[PDB]
């Protein structure tokens, strides 16, 4: 497996919004790099 | 009966529901009677079974 | 691309593409509405195993040859030519279907 | 991101949760076949003129 | 029931390039695709066509590597979709302020040329929907079966 | 080009009726036996009247035996004044994709080698007769090689009955029957001698070890379902163990430095395993479709790549 | 009333279940006709006899 | 009901190609595989057969006298199962399903 | 001419390096086609066969030698077509035998001793490219070993090629893997030599053929017939229909056991002997 974490500097400037909101973790298998965070985390920085 | 298949599949439901619409037929409707499918072509079929 | 057969020069053309599902969750749904002609006739066709192979026979070549003939004979399915070792078993072809 | 709703105890408190994920493209193609005919090669080239 | 085809799915990201819409301007929210047979039965009785000719964008989009986004493809070995912006706003941001809701880079594109097109628009519940059966436009006297 | 295409030109005569000239354009990819590899032949050097001996028209068994004296060529293109063919024995095309046509009632598959047979089948002995020239063309029947190894075995074994039924096949469930026909004695003795020189040469002193292993086989076939499906209902070794109790020799002359089993197999392969090539001719062509399908149907043309 | 249809009679065994007649049938006892046949030369007769 | 609205019939006599195949008396893949883990010894009262004892009369007394404790150890399997109702029989009450 | 084999996405760091390790190794593709999936090449697509099964399947499929291996697709140049177009392709030894200059090279299933892609969960078994004089010997030894294991010898486990010792032993899986050849080779001989024994005493007809027969059988075959009939005996036997089913079977094993070459090695500005592990400049077109 090669799940490289997403790129926060780029995602700091998004191209377009999502619309629907759902619990995401309910279905994971659509994605590759999937991460949950509680309110903040150290590696973000 | 084949065990190695049932043990193989995963248990996520979110996924199976997607697949058992699009799953692949064991038989063929092009044969004269009915056959295991030739390796060539694939018939998407939905097995609720 | 370019290719040639029997003097005819084939030109095959490809374009590459890519897909992503930019929705999170189910973005599409299929629904079954009606039913057309059921393709497989709902018949009674028994299955012979004498097509099969990998079943150790019964020890007396008088009886095995007895059964095989006394079953496979005159059968909608069972082999026309006795099973070749490495060929493919073939099922009799019917004169016509309905 | 995900919203919250506060609650009374004695439910252990819940904190904001942020979901991060990435998707990966999948690659495809298309096909079509143009074939000419032999003599049609001669005429265009001019060989048969 | 048709109301339960349409309400069981979750709309995706909003890209405001598309802008498929009525001749009124109400945007089109979705698409149905049926056989030619089902399409009548729904149009005869169960559904009403709220509009006939739809407005549709013309051009595709284009992502070209011209510019500093090229060098990184060669030298750095990676690429970013529009780096001529992300690269920019990682400068101003480094100075000015913080605002949570921002100006989404995707938003600032100018609209494509939209023309008039003929397709049936139907309202199932609250949303307008292209209601379409392609097997004439496409698959007509081509031997490919209808998926 | 000369190594790739070396295209023989059967010249067509001057006076040909349009019923017969349009018969040739219906014969685009078929098989023509060039007697030599000249660049200029005639239809009288190709047709069935060229194929006859002095007063003696060959039967379907002997008509195989003079295919292999000639050069099988696929026709590529039929111009109004001449017919262009590519001989297989040199090299097919530049890129190498020629077209046959199934005159057989049998479909092909990708990768199947194509052996060609004289027109044996019932309702199939189809000779284009050019009445405005009196030239009949027996175009041969292309078949997959598990058929042509079986049909030639049917035709050889039927003539050996006549020195003192058999004429029905099955291929993919299609019952097809071949024509029961008279067979000449000069043609059969060429076939009969071609067996017994090749079979008896395939027997060596190591074969007396293997004949001891016959009652091992009937001991083994009653257990495995594979050997029970291998031997047959109608074999000979099932009867040739119950009459035959062999014993192996204990010592052999220089039996330490030689290999008894190894020398038998190579002497078997080079004389008996080769034998299906000896009675018939060799499949110098196999089918490699590019993009269409796995199966070329009957009557449809089939792309062609040379076969080692 | 009108011109009289001319009956005929085909002798059959007494055993044959009537259920061969409770839905439209072929009198001959076996389905004839080219419609049913396949593509082969001998079919139409193979069905017949 | 068939496809086309025929009454169709299916019966025992069509079961032949399956049953009549010799492979039903294929076993060893079973017994060879059920004996993987060692199994106990029950009261081998039906599982054992002796050579005929010499005396005509005294034979049964020998039998009774030697087998007393053997019939008092457990209970005879094939007799105990006599009182199992079918519904009772399938339940995992009787370990003898396996 | 060159075909592409698309790698499905989701390849790990070692599995993407695993396809990089097999640069010039042989691949069978079912039909010559521009796009083709990597499941078709894989060992899963062969269904599982033994070594009689793989020799059938190497005669239906179309061999391609892998050229440059890109991270998205595998580029394959087929031997029957594009090697009459492209002249020289490199090909890597995996055999323990050094390829000399100008050798007709066949390919053999790996009987001796196999890259598995874990992220994709399929195995790629490649054949072993050794020349045709050895290919007819090594299979003939391994069949002959299988008969002496059906009752060995001090010899027959050792081959010498080019001054080098070969070891077929290096086993109990191998003898059962190659077992369905052995049951065909034993059947094809013992049915053969009984039809000879049932037809030469049946006819022995003298035109000159028996004069050719018995003079060639003068203490050579008739003494071999009599010594067989001494270890034998001398209703109507179904003789003439047993010829047909044997000729259809005997002519079939000659094509499995032919092991025809595809590759000839015309080296130029290089060593005359390509070692094991190295690449060999390879042609199939004169």
UniProtKB/Swiss-Prot annotation, chain F:
Keywords: Capsid protein, Host nucleus, Virion
Domain of life assignment: Viruses
GO MF term set: structural molecule activity
Entry's localization field: Virion; Host nucleus
InterPro entries (UniProt xref): Herpes_capsid_2 (IPR002690)
GO terms for cellular component: host cell nucleus; viral capsid
Subunit-structure text: Interacts with TRX1 and major capisd protein/MCP.
Purpose of the protein: Structural component of the T=16 icosahedral capsid. The capsid is composed of pentamers and hexamers of major capsid protein/MCP, which are linked together by heterotrimers called triplexes. These triplexes are formed by a single molecule of triplex protein 1/TRX1 and two copies of triplex protein 2/TRX2. Additionally, TRX1 is required for efficient transport of TRX2 to the nucleus, which is the site of capsid assembly.
Family (UniProt): Belongs to the herpesviridae TRX2 protein family.
Protein name: Triplex capsid protein 2
Species assigned in the record: Human herpesvirus 2 (strain HG52) (HHV-2)
Higher taxonomy: Viruses, Duplodnaviria, Heunggongvirae, Peploviricota, Herviviricetes
């Amino acid at each position: 497996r090669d799940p490289p974490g997403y790129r926060y500097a780029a995602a700091m400037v998004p191209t377009g919004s999502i619309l629907s909101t759902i619990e995401v973790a309910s279905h994971r298998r659509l994605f590759d790099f999937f991460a949950r965070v509680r309110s903040d985390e150290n590696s973000l920085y | 009966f084949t065990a190695a298949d049932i043990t193989a599949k995963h248990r996520c439901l979110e996924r199976l529901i997607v697949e058992t619409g699009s799953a692949v037929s064991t038989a063929t409707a092009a044969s004269d009677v009915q056959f295991k499918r030739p390796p060539g072509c694939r018939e998407l079929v939905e097995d609720p079974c | 691309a370019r290719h040639e057969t029997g003097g005819g020069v084939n030109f095959t053309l490809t374009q590459p593409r890519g897909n992503v599902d930019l929705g999170v969750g189910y973005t599409a749904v299929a629904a079954t509405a009606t039913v057309r002609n059921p393709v497989t006739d709902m018949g009674n066709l028994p299955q012979n195993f004498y097509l099969g192979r990998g079943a150790p026979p019964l020890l007396d070549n008088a009886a095995a040859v007895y059964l095989r003939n006394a079953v496979v004979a005159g059968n909608r399915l069972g082999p026309a030519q006795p099973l070749p070792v490495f060929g493919c078993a073939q099922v009799p072809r019917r004169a016509g279907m309905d | 991101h995900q919203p919250l709703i506060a609650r009374d105890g004695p439910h252990p408190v819940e904190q904001p949760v942020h979901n991060y994920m990435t998707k990966v493209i999948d690659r495809r193609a298309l096909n079509a076949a143009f074939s000419l005919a032999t003599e049609a090669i001669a005429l265009l080239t001019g060989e048969a003129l | 029931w048709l109301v339960d085809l349409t309400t069981a799915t979750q709309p995706s990201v909003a890209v405001p390039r598309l802008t498929h819409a009525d001749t009124r301007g109400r945007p089109v929210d979705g698409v149905l695709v049926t056989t030619a047979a089902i399409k009548q039965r729904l149009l005869q009785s169960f559904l009403k066509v709220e509009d006939t000719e739809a407005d549709v964008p013309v051009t595709y989009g284009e992502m070209v590597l011209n510019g500093a986004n090229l060098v990184t493809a060669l030298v750095m070995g990676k690429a970013v979709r529009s780096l001529d912006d992300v690269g920019r706003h990682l400068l101003e941001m480094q100075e000015e302020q913080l605002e949570a809701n921002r100006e989404t880079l995707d938003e600032l594109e100018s609209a494509p040329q939209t023309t008039r097109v003929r397709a049936d628009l139907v309202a199932i519940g609250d949303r307008l929907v292209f209601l379409e059966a392609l097997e004439k436009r496409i698959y007509a006297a081509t031997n490919v079966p209808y998926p | 080009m000369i190594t790739d295409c070396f295209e023989a030109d059967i010249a067509i005569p001057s006076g040909i009726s349009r019923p017969d000239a349009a018969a040739l354009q219906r014969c685009e990819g078929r098989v023509v036996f060039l007697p030599t590899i000249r660049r200029q032949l005639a239809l009288a050097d190709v047709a069935h009247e060229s194929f006859v001996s002095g007063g003696v028209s060959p039967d379907t068994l002997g008509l195989l035996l003079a295919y292999r004296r000639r050069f099988p060529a696929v026709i590529t293109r039929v111009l109004p004044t001449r017919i262009v063919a590519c001989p297989v024995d040199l090299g097919l095309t530049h890129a190498g994709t020629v077209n046959l046509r199934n005159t057989s009632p049998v479909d092909l598959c990708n990768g199947d080698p194509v052996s060609l047979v004289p027109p044996v089948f019932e309702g199939q002995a189809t000779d284009v007769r050019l009445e405005s020239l009196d030239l009949t063309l027996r175009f041969p029947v292309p078949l997959p090689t598990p058929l042509a190894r079986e049909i030639v075995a049917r035709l050889v074994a039927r003539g050996i009955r006549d020195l003192n039924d058999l004429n029905v096949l099955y291929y993919n469930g299609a019952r097809l029957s071949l024509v029961a026909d008279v067979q000449q004695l000069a043609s059969v003795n060429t076939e009969l001698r071609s067996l017994v020189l090749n079979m008896v040469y395939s027997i060596t002193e190591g074969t007396t070890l293997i004949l001891t292993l016959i009652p091992r086989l009937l001991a083994l076939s009653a257990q495995d379902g594979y050997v029970n499906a291998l031997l047959q209902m109608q074999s000979v070794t099932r009867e040739a163990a119950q009459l035959i109790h062999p014993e192996a020799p204990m010592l052999m002359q220089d039996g330490e430095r030689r290999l008894p089993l190894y020398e038998a197999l190579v002497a078997w392969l080079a004389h008996a395993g080769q034998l299906g090539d000896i009675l018939a001719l060799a499949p110098a062509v196999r089918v490699c479709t590019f993009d269409g399908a796995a199966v070329v149907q009957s009557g449809d043309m089939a792309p062609v790549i040379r076969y080692p | 009333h009108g011109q009289d249809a001319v009956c005929e009679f085909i002798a059959t065994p007494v055993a044959t279940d009537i259920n061969y007649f409770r839905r439209p049938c072929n009198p001959r006892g076996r389905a004839a006709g080219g419609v049913y046949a396949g593509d082969k030369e001998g079919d139409v007769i193979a069905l017949m006899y | 009901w068939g496809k086309d609205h025929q009454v169709l019939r299916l019966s025992m006599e069509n079961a032949v190609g399956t049953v009549c195949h010799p492979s039903l008396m294929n076993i060893d893949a079973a017994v060879g595989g059920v004996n993987h883990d060692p199994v106990e010894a029950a009261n081998p009262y039906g599982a054992y057969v002796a050579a005929p004892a010499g005396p005509g009369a005294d034979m049964q007394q020998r039998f009774l006298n030697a087998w007393r404790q053997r019939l008092a150890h457990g209970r005879v399997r094939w007799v105990a199962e006599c009182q199992m109702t079918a519904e009772q029989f399938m339940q995992p009450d009787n370990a003898n399903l396996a």
